[PDB]
Design a protein around this ligand. Sequence first.
Ligand SMILES: [Mg+2]
Length: 356
Amino acid sequence: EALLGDLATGQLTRLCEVAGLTEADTAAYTGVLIESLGTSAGRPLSLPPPSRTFLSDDHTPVEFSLAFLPGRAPHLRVLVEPGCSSGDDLAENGRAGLRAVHTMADRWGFSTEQLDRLEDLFFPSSPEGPLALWCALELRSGGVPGVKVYLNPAANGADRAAETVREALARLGHLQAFDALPRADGFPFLALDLGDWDAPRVKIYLKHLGMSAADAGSLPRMSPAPSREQLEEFFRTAGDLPADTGRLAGRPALTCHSFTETATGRPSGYTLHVPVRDYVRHDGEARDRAVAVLREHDMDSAALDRALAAVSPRPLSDGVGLIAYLALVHQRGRPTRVTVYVSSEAYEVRPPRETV
Ligand SMILES: [Mg+2]
């Protein structure tokens, strides 16, 4: 029976084809994914997940994303919990994740000085959930990926999340960034790029309960402000909230605020993340919403269909959660992207629902 590493690398191989990567680069990145799973790569899929990770709803410690642009193949990313073989003890999971990331950095010549400086803040002796460390790998042509580390602002307790984020940003030299953020209902993730950048590249994720379409257009803080109308339309399409009173009051929308330089004091990016899986009856509907957004943004949806078939052969209508999130991604001076988060579904297919 199939092993976890075998399913995940088969999915990755088929997705690297959608992204247009060479055979050589696909081989490099399948190796990196196997290495990052550690002993869990050899684990039968007939056994429980190695950890009850928050990385995905079924606890697969892998998730994919595809960032679509007009006139070219989508950009592929894989998110992994490299300490998953340590299970649900967060201190050991975090320590194992850190070791895997340091091995990567050494191999590619990335400095870990910024991460080392944040370690005492994100890896205390008795950490709280819901995560310790995930690694996001941007699977670029050439075989050397972009590497980001997802850390837990709530590691010291949820009540210390804002304080933890403020202190991280101060240590990174982004001394005006915290006060630049909009209000939020939580700080689910801080993501640090491990590249060798002069100003650290850091992303703050914020949770917003009960967001409306107008709110989606008013939460950016990046300079220059993105199109309100385009944000409102994306929110209504992804949430099926057409037209006033509509809100996403189940699973919350997230915003991400990215900082790439310290002088302006402002974010350079804004992404709106809609958890489409909680607002559809099944993945046929989530796909319909993804196809609609892509059409509105002049990006080709045939690649989305190939990507879904790459991860699973099932009929979309037979479950929910394959398409986990839909995101609209803005970045200063760069073209806007639509990102689809695609689940591995290595452990469970959630059942379809009679109603939203
Ligand atoms: Mg101020």
